[PDB]
């Protein structure tokens, strides 16, 4: 006897959601007093303490993963 079979799977067009290729204000800023550095990503700011001062970021709150923010008006 004799027989075949079939098979293929197209690629997935992934795109990207970026505003501009970079932003001109950082909403993170070094606290250090006397530290001119800010990154976009709060990632890319973890490392700048590792990388300039060696160390990770403070600490400023507890166990919680809530919003409760202030809602607009
Ligand atoms: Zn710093």
Do not use: M, W
């Amino acid at each position: 006897g004799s027989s075949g079979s079939s098979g293929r799977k197209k690629p997935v067009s992934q795109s990207l959601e970026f505003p501009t290729r970079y932003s001109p204000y950082r909403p993170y800023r070094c606290v250090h007093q006397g530290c001119f550095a800010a990154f976009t990503i709060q990632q890319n700011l973890i490392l700048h303490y590792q990388a300039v001062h060696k160390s990770d970021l403070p600490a400023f709150s507890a166990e919680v993963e809530e919003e409760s923010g202030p809602s607009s008006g």
